[PDB]
Amino acid sequence: ALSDRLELVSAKDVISLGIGEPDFDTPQHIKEYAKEALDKGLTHYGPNIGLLELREAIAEKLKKQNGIEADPKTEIMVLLGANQAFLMGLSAFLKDGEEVLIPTPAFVSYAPAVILAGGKPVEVPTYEEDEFRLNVDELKKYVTDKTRALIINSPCNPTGAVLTKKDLEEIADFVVEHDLIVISDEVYEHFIYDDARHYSIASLDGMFERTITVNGFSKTFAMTGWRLGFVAAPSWIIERMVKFQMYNATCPVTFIQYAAAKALKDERSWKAVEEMRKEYDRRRKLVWKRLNEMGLPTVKPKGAFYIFPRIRDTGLTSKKFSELMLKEARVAVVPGSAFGKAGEGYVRISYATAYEKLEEAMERMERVLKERKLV
């Protein structure tokens, strides 16, 4: 019964570097469209699948930016945050013993959503030497004939890695050969740096039929507290997820759907996303310099707004290194072990905080690294 699956799941001056959301505020003009919606009286229930005009704007964005062709009436569904998608998506198909492969270090909702859907998560390590990009040769070590799905997250949280098109082509070969469904969490697609490119696995030939691509407004617009996300997937999966929603949150907030549908079509939205991306890029270069500078070897992340320094050479546990940085440096970083077994030996730092707080946090980490001769 679900209560059974739920008990198998667990878990003054101080700079928090543990944040997993934009420090920016929602762009003013998106605030303004939600005020207009309230005044227009968009107060009542909407369809379980989302407002058709939001789904249509989302079909346009997916085709033009991601190369995905999805039908608005049938294949895309609006959600209360992209987070709902893991449990509801996996529940449209996962049966009782089935395994889902999760590349690790991974976002924290993946494995519990698998356990709640009734399956068994199987962690597949990614490695520092590979700049944490998934390798299909690790996938092979873990396939069984109970494997039904793979979850991919690019750009990745906690790592900041982004899969290249060739990476995705190989993954696409493995998935088709093993007849898996891929769930692709793309919420960080627009925060990509240097010469990285965001490719969607559902745009490759023959792949839409087998992937659930999840995305949302939370990170690319700074709308985490607005609870609006979406999936584009085959209609037999969408059908099952809206039936689930009927008995869960019924439908998204309908005036926020209006604000967001207009926002996708507004030039100033995209302009604000580049503002934010240029500023996250500036902060990234600082924490990458400074962390390598103080002795913690760190891969330059190509996407999202997280960086993942190697702390294992200080001789500590990622949990003990988190304690020591909080007690003595008063900076909060999250243990890499919280992102799966392959995260032990690292710590997640979010640079979604003001440049200046990051500078100061970096000096404070330095001093107790030197002071406590951990180097």
C-beta closer to ligand PLP: residue 269 or 314 = 269
b/e map 96-117, b = 16+ CB within 10 Å: eebbbbbbbbbbbbbbbbbbbb
Single out the residue of 332, 368, 362 nearest to residue 347, CA to CA: 332
| Partner in contact with 219, chosen from ligand PLP, its own copies, none, beta carbon below 5 to 8 Å by kind | ligand PLP
Should residue 240 be labelled a site residue for its own copies when binding is judged by CB under 8 A?
A: yes
Stretch that binds ligand PLP, among 8-16, 138-146, 216-224, 324-332 (CB under 6 A): 216-224
Stretch that binds ligand PLP, among 196-204, 215-223, 313-321, 334-342 (CB under 6 A): 215-223
Residue 5 assigned as binding residue: no
Q: Cβ(345)–Cβ(159) under 8 Å?
A: no
Should residue 120 be labelled a site residue for its own copies when binding is judged by CB under 8 A?
A: no
Strands 347-350 and 334-335: antiparallel
Should residue 375 be labelled a site residue for its own copies when binding is judged by CB under 8 A?
A: no
Should residue 46 be labelled a site residue for ligand PLP when binding is judged by CB under 6 A?
A: no
Should residue 340 be labelled a site residue for ligand PLP when binding is judged by CB under 6 A?
A: no
Q: Cβ(230)–Cβ(78) under 8 Å?
A: yes
Considering only residues 48, 153, 154, 184, which one is a binding residue for ligand PLP as defined by CB under 6 A? 153
Residue 20 assigned as binding residue: yes
Strands (E), the chain: 15-16, 76-79, 99-104, 120-125, 147-153, 181-185, 211-216, 229-232, 306-307, 331-332, 334-335, 347-350
Amino acid making up residue 348: R
Should residue 80 be labelled a site residue for its own copies when binding is judged by CB under 8 A?
A: yes
Should residue 301 be labelled a site residue for ligand PLP when binding is judged by CB under 6 A?
A: no
Residue 227 assigned as binding residue: yes
Torsion region of 179: left, alpha or beta (phi above 0 gives left; psi -120 to 50 gives alpha):
left
The DSSP 8-state label assigned to residue 214 in this structure reads: E
Shortest Cβ distance from residue 328 to ligand PLP (Å)? Answer: 28
- Which residues would be at the binding site for ligand PLP (CB under 6 A)? 20, 81-83, 107, 153, 157, 185, 187, 216, 218-219, 224, 229, 250
